[PDB]
Write a protein that binds this ligand. Structure first.
Ligand SMILES: CCCCCCCCCCCCCCCCCC(=O)OC[C@H](COP(=O)(O)OCCN)OC(=O)CCCCCCCCCCCCCCCCC
Ligand SMILES: CC(C)CCC[C@@H](C)[C@H]1CC[C@H]2[C@@H]3CC=C4C[C@@H](OC(=O)CCC(=O)O)CC[C@]4(C)[C@H]3CC[C@]12C
Ligand SMILES: *[C@@H]1O[C@H](CO)[C@@H](O[C@@H]2O[C@H](CO)[C@@H](O)[C@H](O)[C@H]2NC(C)=O)[C@H](O)[C@H]1NC(C)=O
Ligand SMILES: [Ca+2]
Lengths: 48, 222, 143, 80, 48, 201, 48, 158
């Protein structure tokens, strides 16, 4: 029971690293570089 | 010498805890505070002895209440957990059904003798000559024991344990080749007796990977 | 040249499937050993090679496709391997027959579009693999 | 005493070969995302602490054989 | 020794390219089939 | 007995099952006395003698050392040809130019498995069943043991399985149960006192 | 070795899976009006 | 008339029926006592006799035609008809030690009856059965990939 419970809890706390470390910022998953974003602002600031 | 020193530190910390906990109830006359007297009660009673020593580990568990974001993260975990209220049930049901099927298929067929020359448990008695590393010139006398596999399918609980180990993807080839060699109710194995029995393991692996990738997609990716 | 519209290509697809079955029922024995089935399959593969070498032989009319070049390489390698065993490590060169089932993705448009989609949907995630190789090289040098 | 400086030669590459257009942002945004939520790692730390203490308390006495899974390299006898 | 270690590219391609394909088979069978069961009950909850 | 050991040295026996074949042959020559004549042959698309003898030899201490030394030198390579292996074996039993035992004629086949019954050779070389054929299937494999079982059944022989090293010592001595069958049926005329060679107690 | 399994597979495997499946969800918005999303909503009420 | 099937007591009795059926199957173990086999080999006999009775009740009260409308009803009648074959072959001359094991697995399919009315698992299987046609191409590509590397490995390391 020690090892099985530890494995399940470890796998349950590893899901919190996918729902709170990667899915927290969706502004990059569907970045859509073609139309608009922050890259244009960064390039304009650098040219300025 | 080290163990005695650490015992004196427990006296000091518990004294600090017990002089502060009574202060809290002075301004009262909410629910997580019950764990606060839970730990102090364990320590003084500690002064089965093996249970009080293992139950006193809940020191960092009450640090959640004093922290702001820690309680929010714990509540988010408790909300997250209910998301898979359905899948986590169907996967358990499928594991139980596959455990019962495996019990029917490999009931008692995983036994084997210490020397790979006796098939019946009646022939696996006494001593035998074992040759180390396959060398015929270096024999050693060993006793033969009619042993059973560590992860067998004798009953439903053992089948569930074996299938869980398979679903963790660890040691599953060894179990697969043990089941391929599985002969009969109370006899030893034969090299590649029934290769086709791997369909059971392959199907179980496929439909467990499908589900584990189904409750992980609609949890983090949806 | 004019009859090759639909009955002819289904024949080629079924021949490829039969060749896959024959190549799957071949038992690789250790150190030149064999049985009767392997000899019969070796005799059968002549027919398959004769048909697959005539496919491009009667293919004039197509030359720049990414699949026709693979077909030509398979045909030339098979011929060079068959002519290298009649006059006499030729067994190593026989590993090109496993590329014949790769023709099935070209003969099925539903598979052809899916392969192109899966190969074109992994260009944006290339940077990740670059970082993987970067870290692997750093850790190898550190080791 | 001489290895610490000699090892540091490998890290002179990254400062100049990380300048690719896009990889900088890819690393930078994700390290910001990781640093933005440090409380979730505290749960894993507490889990490991609790389970390690329990393991050393209830399995810590077992000896270290050389053909066993509990050996000089794998044991419950020490917190690390 | 020698060129016996050059046949270890077979197990790398089979692992890297075989695991990749499995993602596109298992992610596409849940992203667009598990999200289809979200709107499925959305219209069933509208009638409830 | 006029023993003659046939060893399969085809490609399929390479690996562990060649180690057991060489050990089973070595532990079987230990059951041959000075009155028994033995020779060892091998076949892989071609049958040849494994040693320098080329005919049945007295199998004394010196001769058995040569055969034992020559057995632990054979390599597995080539295809299997049972007709050529048995034709070569049946020709050495019919030599009669050299000194022999003029007694039990037996052929021992140490192999793994095949699909060739070679029934055209047994109907040509021994129609009267004057030569016993004992067949051994050695190693862990899945090859067809049917023809190997049939070979030992038509020719008054026996079929033996040697999967691992533990079965080598006991399976290489049970062939004397078969060879003692005619002596039992003789009755009182087979009960004659014999004396061994000089040996250390 | 510990840092090689944390920075290595664990982390990066997070990136590969997040980025790959990020486009699957992105394609769903394209799929939302490509010809299946409205069809599935149609064939769930008539069956009931 | 029609209220002997939709009644709450009928469904709550079917739940207990399925629970007993699965308890008789999941109670097997290696070296089980003979009395457990007796009490377990007659339990299916009294359960198959009662399940067949319920099938007869439901067949002649709802109509012979409307029964084979949902996929689950055909599954249930298939399971019930397969149980009859198992009960008679194990008593006739045909022994089938492996055939016995396969038939007892069929009786394990009755547990799906209690999960039938969950309104969520049906959506999962419905979505899969309607979406397998749009990914059979990718699954066949994966299988072709498997076959190609199986043959290549057989050639290289055979
Ligand atoms: C819990 C809270 C944190 C949770 C973390 C969650 C994520 C999981 C990450 C796990 C990383 C674990 C890596 C640490 C392992 C260190 C180790 O193996 O060292 C143990 C070793 C004991 O040596 P020993 O066998 O007693 O014999 C000594 C010979 N004279 O040597 C020592 O004991 C060295 C001295 C100890 C102090 C430095 C070692 C690191 C301590 C742990 C750091 C991470 C926690
Ligand atoms: C979903 C519901 C129906 C669960 C039903 C519970 C039983 C099917 C489980 C729980 C208790 C399990 C039993 C737990 C304890 C044991 C004893 C065990 O045998 C022995 O104790 C001695 C073994 C020997 O004599 O060699 C066999 C498995 C068995 C009966 C298990 C068989 C399966 C049982 C009966
Ligand atoms: C010895 O064996 C040979 C063959 O195994 C027998 O055959 C004769 O061999 C001798 C020459 O060695 C020649 O006479 C002929 O070539 C063979 N045939 C005949 C009919 O003689 C031979 O008969 C055996 N016996 C002797 C005394 O040689
Ligand atoms: Ca052979």
């Amino acid at each position: 029971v020690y090892f099985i419970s530890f494995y399940m809890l470890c796998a349950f706390l590893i899901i919190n690293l996918f729902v709170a470390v990667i899915m927290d910022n969706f502004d990059y998953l569907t970045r859509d570089w073609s139309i608009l974003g922050p890259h244009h602002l960064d390039e304009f600031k650098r040219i300025w | 010498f080290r163990n005695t020193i650490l015992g004196y530190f427990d006296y000091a910390f518990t004294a600090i805890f017990t002089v502060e906990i009574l202060l809290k109830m002075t301004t009262f006359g909410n629910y997580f505070n019950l764990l606060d007297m839970l730990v102090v009660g364990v320590s003084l009673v500690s002064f089965v002895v093996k249970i009080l020593r293992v139950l006193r580990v809940l020191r960092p568990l009450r640090a959640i209440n004093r922290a702001k974001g820690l309680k929010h993260v714990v509540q988010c975990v408790f909300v997250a957990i209910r998301t898979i209220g359905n899948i986590m049930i169907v996967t358990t049901l499928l594991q139980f059904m596959f455990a019962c099927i495996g019990v029917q298929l490999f009931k008692g067929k995983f036994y084997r003798c210490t020397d790979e020359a006796k098939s019946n448990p009646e022939e696996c008695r006494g001593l035998f000559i074992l040759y180390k590393d396959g060398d015929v010139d270096s024999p050693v006398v060993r006793e033969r024991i009619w042993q059973n596999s560590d992860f067998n399918f004798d009953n439903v609980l053992s089948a569930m344990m074996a299938l869980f180990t398979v679903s963790t993807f660890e040691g599953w080839p060894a179990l697969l080749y043990k089941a391929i060699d599985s002969n009969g109710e109370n006899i030893g194995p034969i090299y590649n007796h029934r290769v086709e029995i791997s369909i059971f393991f392959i199907i179980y692996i496929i439909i467990v990977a499908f589900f584990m990738m189904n409750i992980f997609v609609g949890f983090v990716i949806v | 040249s004019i009859v090759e519209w639909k009955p002819f290509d289904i024949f080629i697809l079924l021949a490829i499937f039969a060749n896959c079955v024959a190549l799957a029922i071949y038992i690789p024995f250790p150190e030149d050993d064999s049985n009767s089935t392997n000899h019969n399959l070796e005799k059968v593969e002549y027919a398959f090679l004769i048909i697959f070498t005539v496919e491009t032989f009667l293919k004039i009319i197509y030359v720049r496709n990414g699949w026709n070049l693979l077909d030509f390489v398979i045909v030339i390698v098979g011929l060079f391997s068959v002519i290298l065993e009649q006059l006499t490590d030729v067994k190593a060169l026989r590993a090109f027959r496993v590329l014949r089932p790769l023709r099935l993705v070209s003969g099925v448009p539903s598979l052809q579009v899916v392969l192109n989609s899966i190969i074109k949907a992994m260009v944006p995630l290339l940077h990740i693999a670059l970082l993987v190789l970067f870290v692997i090289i750093i850790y190898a040098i550190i080791g | 005493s001489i290895t610490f400086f000699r090892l540091f030669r490998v890290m002179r590459l990254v400062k100049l070969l990380s300048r690719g257009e896009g990889i900088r942002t890819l690393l930078w945004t994700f390290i910001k995302s990781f640093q933005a939520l440090p409380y979730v790692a505290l749960l894993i730390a507490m889990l490991f602490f609790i389970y390690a203490v329990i393991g050393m308390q209830m399995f810590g006495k077992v000896a270290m054989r050389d053909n066993n899974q509990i050996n000089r390299n794998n044991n419950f006898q020490t917190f690390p | 020794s020698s060129s016996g270690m050059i046949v270890c590219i077979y197990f790398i391609i089979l692992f890297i390219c075989g695991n990749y394909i499995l993602l596109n088979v298992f992610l596409a069978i849940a992203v667009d089939n598990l999200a289809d069961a979200e709107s499925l009950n959305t219209a069933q909850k509208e009638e409830a | 007995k006029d023993m003659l050991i046939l060893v399969d040295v085809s490609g399929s026996v390479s690996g562990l099952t060649l180690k057991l074949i060489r050990t089973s042959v070595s532990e079987m020559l230990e059951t041959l006395s000075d009155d028994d004549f033995v020779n060892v042959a091998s076949f892989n698309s071609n049958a040849q003698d494994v040693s320098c003898f080329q005919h049945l030899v007295q199998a004394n201490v010196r001769n058995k050392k040569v055969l034992k030394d020559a057995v632990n030198n054979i390599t597995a390579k080539g295809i299997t040809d049972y007709k050529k292996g048995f034709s070569f074996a049946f020709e050495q039993l019919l030599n009669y130019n050299v000194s022999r035992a003029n007694c039990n004629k037996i052929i021992m086949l140490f192999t793994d498995g095949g699909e060739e019954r070679a029934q055209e050779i047994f109907n040509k070389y021994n129609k009267d069943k004057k030569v016993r054929v004992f067949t051994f299937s050695v190693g862990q494999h899945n090859y067809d043991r049917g023809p190997i079982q049939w070979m030992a059944c038509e020719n008054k022989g026996y079929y033996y399985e040697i999967p691992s090293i533990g079965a080598i010592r006991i399976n290489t001595q049970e062939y004397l149960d078969v060879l003692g069958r005619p002596m039992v049926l003789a009755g009182d005329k087979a009960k004659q006192v014999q004396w061994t060679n000089v040996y250390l107690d | 070795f510990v840092s090689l399994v944390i920075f290595g597979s664990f982390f990066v495997l997070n990136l590969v899976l997040g980025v790959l499946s990020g486009e699957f969800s992105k394609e769903r918005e394209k799929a939302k009006a490509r010809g299946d999303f409205q069809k599935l909503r149609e064939k769930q009420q008539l069956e009931e | 008339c029609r209220a002997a099937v939709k009644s709450v007591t009928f469904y709550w009795l079917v739940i207990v029926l399925v629970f007993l059926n699965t308890l008789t199957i999941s109670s097997e173990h290696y070296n089980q006592p003979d009395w457990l086999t007796q009490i377990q080999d007659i339990a299916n006999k009294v359960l198959l006799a009662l399940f067949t009775c319920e099938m007869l009740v439901k067949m002649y009260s709802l109509g012979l035609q409307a029964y084979f409308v949902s996929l689950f009803n055909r599954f249930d009648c298939f399971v019930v008809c397969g149980g009859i074959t198992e009960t008679i072959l194990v008593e006739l001359e045909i022994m089938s030690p492996l055939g016995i094991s396969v038939f007892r697995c069929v009786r394990l399919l009755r547990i799906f009856k209690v999960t039938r009315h969950w309104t969520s698992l049906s959506n999962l299987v419905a979505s899969l059965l309607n979406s397998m046609k749009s990914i059979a191409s990718l699954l066949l590509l994966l299988f072709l990939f498997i076959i190609i590397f199986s043959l290549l490995g057989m050639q290289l390391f055979g």
